[PDB]
Symmetry: D2
Subunit: 380 residues, 4 copies
Amino acid sequence: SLVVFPFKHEHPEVLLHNVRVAAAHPRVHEVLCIGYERDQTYEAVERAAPEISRATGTPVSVRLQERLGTLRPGKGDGMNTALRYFLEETQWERIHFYDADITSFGPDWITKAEEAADFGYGLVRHYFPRASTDAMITWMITRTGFALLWPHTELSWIEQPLGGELLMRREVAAMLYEDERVRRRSDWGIDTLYTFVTVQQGVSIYECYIPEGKAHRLYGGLDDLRTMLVECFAAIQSLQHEVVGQPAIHRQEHPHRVPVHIAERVGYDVEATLHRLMQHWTPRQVELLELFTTPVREGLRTCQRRPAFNFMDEMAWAATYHVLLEHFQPGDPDWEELLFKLWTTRVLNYTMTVALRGYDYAQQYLYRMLGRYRYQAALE
Amino acid sequence: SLVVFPFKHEHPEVLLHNVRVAAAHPRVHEVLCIGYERDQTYEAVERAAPEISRATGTPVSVRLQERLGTLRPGKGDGMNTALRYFLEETQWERIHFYDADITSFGPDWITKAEEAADFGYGLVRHYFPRASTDAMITWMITRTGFALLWPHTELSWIEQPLGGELLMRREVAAMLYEDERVRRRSDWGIDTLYTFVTVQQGVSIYECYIPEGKAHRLYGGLDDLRTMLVECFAAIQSLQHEVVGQPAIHRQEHPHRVPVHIAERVGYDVEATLHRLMQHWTPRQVELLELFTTPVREGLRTCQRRPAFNFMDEMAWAATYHVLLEHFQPGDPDWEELLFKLWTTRVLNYTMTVALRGYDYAQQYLYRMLGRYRYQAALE
Amino acid sequence: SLVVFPFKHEHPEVLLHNVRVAAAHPRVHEVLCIGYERDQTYEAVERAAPEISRATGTPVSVRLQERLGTLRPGKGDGMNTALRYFLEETQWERIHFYDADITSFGPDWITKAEEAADFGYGLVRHYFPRASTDAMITWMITRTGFALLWPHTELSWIEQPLGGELLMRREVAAMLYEDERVRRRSDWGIDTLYTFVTVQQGVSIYECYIPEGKAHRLYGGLDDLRTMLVECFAAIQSLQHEVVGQPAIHRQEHPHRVPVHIAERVGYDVEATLHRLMQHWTPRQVELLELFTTPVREGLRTCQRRPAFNFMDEMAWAATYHVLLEHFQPGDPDWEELLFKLWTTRVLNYTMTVALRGYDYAQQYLYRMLGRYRYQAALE
Amino acid sequence: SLVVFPFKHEHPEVLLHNVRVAAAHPRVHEVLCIGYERDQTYEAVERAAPEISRATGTPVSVRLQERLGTLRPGKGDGMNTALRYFLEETQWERIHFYDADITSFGPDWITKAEEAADFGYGLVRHYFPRASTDAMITWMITRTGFALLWPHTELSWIEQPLGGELLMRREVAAMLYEDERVRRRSDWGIDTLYTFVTVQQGVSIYECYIPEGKAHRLYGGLDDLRTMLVECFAAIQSLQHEVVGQPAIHRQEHPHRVPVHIAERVGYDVEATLHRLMQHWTPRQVELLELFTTPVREGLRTCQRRPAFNFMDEMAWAATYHVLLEHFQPGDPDWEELLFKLWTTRVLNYTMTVALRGYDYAQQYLYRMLGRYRYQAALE
Ligand SMILES: [Mn+2]
Ligand SMILES: [Mn+2]
Ligand SMILES: [Mn+2]
Ligand SMILES: [Mn+2]
């Protein structure tokens, strides 16, 4: 069973630790390492690869990601390349996928996934405890969108639809690789496409939990997440007229208690995010806001002079999400920048009205937020 | 919608509150109250019935429990009598079921259930927060048995399978009434039967959640649950050779944090439960223990002289359960006692090794226990 | 025992409840109600006074606030007026003080205070659970200042030093009335003065705890605390060169777990508090910042253009506090504004780096912060 | 500053790790290791000692404990011997004391203690988070006794009066060594004597907290604690007619949040403890119970046939404690065995009525239990 590791610019030590863990496992029959470019990180893994495939017995190869899609060359080209090598150049029946930077990795990840895949699941998906102010794309964009567009389906119930940690058996991989929509998704939008089309095609999905597991992403402003945001939203927008059957088997490993050190985590720099909400304005962005409801139009125009976000409550965000679905133009610098400020005001609003009330209150909220969105869409 | 209240020797004011609350609800068309005998509590409901019918504009009937099954005349006869009335004497699309003593009932119970059934679900079950040491039949008998016997199915994933608070649509209620296995189950076993056969027949199920739970029963030795225990185990034993499919659509409102009073609650009298373990011994029971694995035989026989329960861990209980499934005879006095004592040692073991570790541990233990039983059963 | 209720424009029913509850208490001999003006709220208490005096057998007087001090005519004048009445017009061994708006007052407040004074304590202070983001004057001004100036003493260990709920014995109340520093403190600063001088004069102190806290004030920008802030800081500034002994006996009932509603509460309007930071600037304030360390000068001057607060960590606030102690002028409009803005940046910093981590973190941060200030001050 | 390590039969690896940590510290000027006997453990430390005093620079000697007291040769002779070597054979001004088995040890222990001792404290006392069913001697014997006998004093407010982790400056050590009562306390009673006489003599006491720190003592029945119990109680009994001034300066480092893995700990084997309550009976123990109140006499006599403990509530225990103070004869096998069963019934009662309600509820209880005991004694 193949085990793929997409990397780019990560410290090669951590990666190579995870690759050793993988090759040692008695249920892993090959390891593939798909780099972004021929940098020093990649050069390091290419020299290390002959060594690990000798001590452990299992072969380990390294390849550059190919240009398979039509958007930005990113995560999507890397994962779809792994698919091409899995189907066309080997004959294994199971492929794993793990982020390279994961310092929390262990043998318990790979075993659980293979163990669940024995019950016959086409797709096993890992999911971990996340801080109340992390995962804001997941919650306010991916899950909210799935809730508002496909409330009766399993889509919005998937815990971490942007997650790169998963297993997929051969038929499932082959189906995704042949699918024109996922093939062209060469950027951050790929995880959204794997998730959406597996559910649409009736693939049965287990979700593995991981008690404690994640590499605390970097403390900066919400700016750092800007590219991922506009691409993840575009992905959902591109799927908005698709139809999805209700039936699809879906189960999820019970979540163990969130460890303290994750519940006590802050997901972003509040000051930098407020400052950034006042930057990069343009007369067209002000013109384009006329398309939104009055409180949102008025609210965000205030951000030219001072930070504003109390306006962007749960309802305001839904109303804003519908307008974005209709009018957002991927690749348009003004539309991309407005999405980023709007989403920012939502993150700030939720942070001070919800997160600030404590990690528990944040979890109950977020599950219940999806519930009301589900209900509001089913009605209309 | 019909709203049914099965009652016994209840505070008549606690019952009449819930009757008035349901009759005032705009989605409710009728209220039925079922009791076994025309005792003082019954004549009160009948004498009040005309007054509530005027004030709310909703008819309020009161009927006797009829003998429709062939086991002990109990809860099942009462619930199936309401199904009968609902199908033969009315023409409403929906029926509710609520225990009478619940002192937490507000109009929100009926509102959330009817909103859930709009989505189109055929069954809506209410689930609640419970204490680590309540729900020991639910956990160690009903769910455990579902997990051991039908691991690949939805049965062990249902939260409150013995719960009597629920909503069915006319077609679901009809199917259950016509079914000979549920008709016969006149005793405590009925909730197990409604749960099992709806899952077998591919009924779509939503699980509502009421934020403030039920009203907690009397604090006494496990002694009080003895009849419920044998009858719930018999229900499952009776279904043991049934076949059940993998598919049946199942969802559930997200649970809110347990309230303090519930997490800080002891479910039973530990002293009295220990004392009871050394009582009602017979020679025959001593010999019957020969059918069990050695640690369970030696473990329980100790209880003639002093309370023992360390031996009855999670594995030993699974092995015990399998032996009971093959040899336990509902109505054989010694078999019933041995089940009572065997389950008591599980509860005590669970209490001292799990419940005593804090409520959050208790919940996570319990969701994971079902996981392990599921897995063992699938791999054999 | 005398029981004093200082009131303003309160719901007259909320006040009269607390008056009736105290008058019915068997350990209470008189109740005094003090207000500034004979407004509608005052005439209500006077018109009801004869009726309560009959029903409970306890006299109920109502007096005007007299001008006994030389600062703003405020809380101090009212509290010292009650001390006057208590010492010159009655002969009771004890006096109570309770804010009027507290909607949580039961007879247990007076019971626990009088039981504590039996042990023989001269002061009994009530303390409560508060939210991470309430009590920002208490923490960052009163306690912080006690810790920096008198680290080897009991002052910074008192829980609710600005709290007006307390009991004194006749001898303690007499000492405070005769003291020229507390007599003069007619404004918000009075609670600081009662706290400080009782500790200086070796009064023995018990700290009662009421399990359900106060009634929480209005949700608005830090703006509302502005007068309280300057006046509380001035109180401490005014005592800065005092000497205080190491010995003064001090104990405190153990605190019970905070209730959910309190731990999940935001103390202030984060948007409005940020906006307020960019308002009411003057050139003079810009120049005054020259007295401060460079990071605080650059940090606050940013606020003319956009909200900044990361720079105002725990150390920078200590350095800021020392500069304020030497240069702050109560009544100089620009000094008061700069304190307001400086303290606002501390509160915001604290909020985003500490409070947002969960209520349990907030408490432990705060007890440890006092520890570190204490230590720095002792080692210099 | 000397740093003493009393050992006996501990694994020498852990000990020698702690001794290396100590000798490295720049504020530690010597290390003394007082063994119980000349076993293999001691022989191992004697060969290792010349090595550690070479790499680190600080000298390290090992001595056998001397016979200084009149009771069992135990902890007390070991600690008092350290005192003799500290005063008579060196000239250091500070002596530490640490349990040998502590696997959680670090540099943060020694630094904090020396740092607090700079403020001038005669006695610094470490204290750590403990499980709800550990520390049952501390709570039901030492602290309860201090509360019932000396309620107005600081004695019962000391967090861990049986703790061996502390620092004491020269004058304090010399005072204890000269004190005839502490010198003769050669057994488990010594910690009680250090605590009692330091408070009686007005020694000023800081309590260091340790966030996470303790070696989970062995999982067995309450039997394992039997010797410590009868000696710790005897110690209190021997002090019951002493007089204690109220004044004595006392402060304590704020406790950080209890880590999960300690809150999820079970302090003893419930089954073995119940069985043991039915063992070692004697006609004289039944005769001696006639001296106790009726519910306690009747309750414990039941334990001849079956385990009983619901009787032994908080009040029953106090009434029982007073009778024990008057009639308990140290060294008498029947009196010692009755104390052990009585205390056992109290532990079991608290475990199932208090601990079982969750670690938080257990902490609030135990602080409040001391409060009522304090109040009940002050009255009478
Ligand atoms: Mn990553
Ligand atoms: Mn009931
Ligand atoms: Mn107020
Ligand atoms: Mn030890």
